Design a protein around this ligand. Structure first.
Ligand SMILES: Nc1ncnc2c1ncn2[C@@H]1O[C@H](COP(=O)(O)O)[C@@H](O)[C@H]1O
Ligand SMILES: Nc1ncnc2c1ncn2[C@@H]1O[C@H](COP(=O)(O)O)[C@@H](O)[C@H]1O
Ligand SMILES: [Cl-]
Ligand SMILES: [Cl-]
Ligand code: NA
Ligand code: NA
Ligand code: NA
Ligand code: NA
Ligand code: NA
Ligand code: NA
Lengths: 363, 361
């Protein structure tokens, strides 16, 4: 009773009575007991949450003893969740720790997280499998739960550059790109706060399908804690920064109008023209061409245009460019209808064709 | 077996390159203090490679130091902090030699502790709280040319992004760093000592008021780790042939000459003991590169404060050559009162800035 309070005396003195009282009553769901999740579960419990749940099927491979905070030679081949509850039941016997040695899915979530008829306060994504994460975040958002997602920690080697901001604003982190694009594709643009760092290492040997490669055995720690920290502060009501968002709705509208015009010029069907709404103009400009004309590189006064004459309107057959560039394009390649090989050089058409192949991956 | 080490540490091996690891193995790392930050540090370098660490921490694993310490559990409370680690780390890294030391750290024993076995220390990590001992340590680190990192403070820290690693010189902002740097500079050293710290502004809710009797307040369970992990990350990335930010220092040595030149010149126009390193302190640390009269950073100079007192650190003020000339005629030569020339708003701020400095002596 009064022995518990002396263990966390530090946090009681910092966040206060009102703040700390609010943390105890919460219930957190950790999806991924891996090298990054490991820490959250610990730190959350060390800093003193009574109830958390860990969801991870796989066992601790000899690999993980480089990063995993609480594991040890003796825990090789222990289900990652099973090891935590064992190495946290010596920190806090008071703490209920629901350990689930099963995989998470869209279909089992309803009957697994609500278990014993109690809602969760927080979902912490600490997954690796792209296909599984996006699904979790979709489910996390659409049910309106306070939720934070870890991005990958691969290629990262400086703890100063790490950050927590809205998934929308991870432009320059190649690791995040793979998920937020796939998550944007399902409509979710700016709902989620996430960890990551804008650290690029292209001069390394290492080695357009981008993948998770190596990682420095400390960094995952940094992430885990920085999440826990961010949880602890958000939950408590301590002052933090709000997440800035990258929705240039005004800019997406102005573009759409330059496309919605083109559809009245060509005089094409209303059942194909309405397909491109504000929602999808955003995706196209921000995630595909990254606010940059693929022919030149300019970013001032752009517009959309049907890419080929004969083919239907879709993401595979459309592109943005400078007004002047779409003026030419509209006039030359599709209205007069001459082959695009004489209007555009080799260099560019290879950059375009691949830039659709990459879009066809996320479809 | 070698194979154990490699297959266990593989992901790092593949990250930094075998040539990188070779160096990590060679390292003999002294970690002074193993309380919150120290504990973190120690664990990670062992866990991430290093097979030779010394730890120096008297106090025992307090029941409160559970939401902080990196491994410690209820079973091993009331146990020497250095031992607790040795046990947990010798279960994860049997290959690793962790010479724990119950004893406390002094300027005198330092050598007879660290060099005892005969191996020269490659890297020192300050994780202390007693300011005296910390300075005494950082002092020792530099005089014995040992690549050294030092935790500053985790007091009033909320933001895991603001955590920076850099030189003492650059930590102007972080309020905690002052007491540590100030003394350090006045011992005769304000460059070379790498330090982790958050320059996170003092949180408003729990302009001429600065009297440094301000100290450490409450921690936040997670933050110590951020510091620990980061200075581990740092040490690992440095030792291994891996690229790095390369922290750069704000020691305006050129400036100090040009301002001292004004002071030295004022002495020859009147009727010289003041050092260049002493000015640098007066300039950067006390007046903070800004006149207390105007606030401008341009065309600055020194000048004897009042004619009655001896030329000391508590009786020379930095200001514009504009302000030097006026002050020189009116207070040094014409012999006027101080209340007569300068506003009381200034003369207070100047008094406090001496009562600040008065402490550090
Ligand atoms: N679909 C999934 N649902 C839940 N956990 C998963 C799923 N796929 C993988 N995991 C686990 O989550 C871990 C992610 O942690 P990490 O690789 O350290 O970021 C993996 O190592 C798996 O053990
Ligand atoms: N003079 C000293 N020499 C070495 N270690 C010290 C000295 N004074 C205090 N410490 C240790 O510094 C650590 C700081 O950790 P903490 O008290 O948790 O902030 C404690 O574990 C102390 O035992
Ligand atoms: Cl959120
Ligand atoms: Cl063992
Ligand atoms: Na809330
Ligand atoms: Na519109
Ligand atoms: Na150094
Ligand atoms: Na400290
Ligand atoms: Na930063
Ligand atoms: Na100097």
């Amino acid at each position: 009773d009064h022995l518990f309070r002396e263990q966390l005396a530090r946090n009681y003195a910092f966040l206060g009575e009102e703040g700390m009282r609010k943390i105890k009553e919460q219930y957190i769901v950790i999806v991924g007991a891996g090298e990054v999740g490991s820490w959250v579960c610990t730190m959350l419990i060390r800093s003193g949450c009574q109830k958390i749940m860990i969801i991870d099927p796989e066992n601790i491979s000899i690999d993980s003893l480089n990063t995993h905070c609480c594991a040890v030679l003796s825990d090789i081949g222990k289900p990652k969740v099973q090891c935590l509850k064992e190495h946290l039941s010596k920190i806090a016997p008071w703490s209920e720790i629901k350990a689930r040695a099963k995989a998470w899915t869209k279909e089992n979530s309803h009957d697994l997280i609500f278990a014993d008829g109690e809602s969760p306060t927080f979902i912490v994504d600490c997954l690796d499998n792209l296909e599984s994460k996006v699904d979790l975040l979709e489910y996390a958002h659409h049910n309106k739960i306070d939720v934070i997602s870890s991005m990958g920690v691969a290629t990262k080697s400086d703890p100063t550059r790490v950050s927590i901001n809205d998934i929308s604003m991870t432009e320059f982190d190649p690791i995040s790109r793979c998920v937020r694009r796939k998550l944007r594709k399902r409509g979710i643009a700016t709902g989620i706060s996430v960890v990551f760092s804008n650290e690029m290492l292209d001069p390394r040997r290492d080695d357009e399908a981008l993948r998770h490669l190596p990682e420095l055995g400390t960094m995952p720690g940094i992430f885990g804690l920085s999440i826990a920290t961010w949880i602890l502060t958000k939950v408590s009501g301590y002052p933090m920064k709000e997440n800035e968002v990258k929705n240039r709705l005004k800019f997406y509208d102005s573009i759409l109008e330059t496309f919605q015009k083109q559809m009245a010029r060509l005089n094409e069907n209303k059942e194909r023209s309405s397909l491109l709404g504000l929602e999808e103009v955003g995706y196209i400009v921000e995630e595909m061409f990254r606010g940059k004309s693929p022919i030149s590189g300019y970013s001032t006064k752009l517009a959309l245009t049907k890419w080929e004459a004969n083919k239907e309107i879709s993401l595979t057959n459309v592109v943005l460019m400078t007004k002047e560039e779409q003026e030419i394009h509209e006039k030359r390649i599709l209205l007069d209808g001459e082959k695009l090989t004489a209007v555009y050089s080799e260099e560019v058409l290879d950059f375009i064709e691949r830039l659709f192949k990459e879009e066809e991956y996320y479809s």
